[PDB]
């Protein structure tokens, strides 16, 4: 592998919000395929349903059935169908948080990450050690 295998506790039985304390945003996947973060906890597009393919690998699906994905240039988008860009390595980080690494671009260490302003970070701009990549799964 290219990454450690410390896994977070928790299951995928129910949907979850993914909160980033970097800017205080919940990860959001809009029906138009746009991905960003919002502080509005009443938002109807922050409820995410995760599911595991292989141990430690996950799909992250929006309320409308879209799949979080990272494209060839490191930009997150919501895909209508599951493809190789939709698999993420879900890992425990700092003994507490959840991080999501693009499986397809794992060797480049590209993570799901939210900037302090709520915009998504592009793959190459993410790195181990940033607060932007740290998420806390929360009940809806």
From Swiss-Prot:
Tissue and organ distribution: Predominantly expressed in kidney and brain. Detected at much lower levels in heart and skeletal muscle.
Localization of this protein: Secreted; Cytoplasm; Cytoplasm, Cell cortex; Cytoplasm, Cytosol
Biological process terms in GO annotation: activation of protein kinase B activity; anatomical structure morphogenesis; angiogenesis; branch elongation involved in ureteric bud branching; cellular response to heat; epithelial cell proliferation; fibroblast growth factor receptor signaling pathway; lung development
Keywords: Acetylation, Angiogenesis, Cytoplasm, Developmental protein, Differentiation, Growth factor, Heparin-binding, Mitogen, Nucleus, Phosphoprotein, Secreted
Effect on the protein of changing residue 22 to A: No effect on integrin-binding
UniProt cross-references to SMART domains, sorted A to Z: FGF
Reported impact of residue 98 to A: No effect on integrin-binding. No effect on integrin- and heparin-binding, loss of FGFR1-binding, defective in inducing FGF1 signaling, cell proliferation and cell migration
Role noted for this protein: Plays an important role in the regulation of cell survival, cell division, angiogenesis, cell differentiation and cell migration. Functions as a potent mitogen in vitro. Acts as a ligand for FGFR1 and integrins. Binds to FGFR1 in the presence of heparin leading to FGFR1 dimerization and activation via sequential autophosphorylation on tyrosine residues which act as docking sites for interacting proteins, leading to the activation of several signaling cascades. Binds to integrin ITGAV:ITGB3.
Name of the protein in question: Fibroblast growth factor 1
Lineage, opening ranks: Eukaryota, Metazoa, Chordata, Craniata, Vertebrata
Underlying gene: FGF1
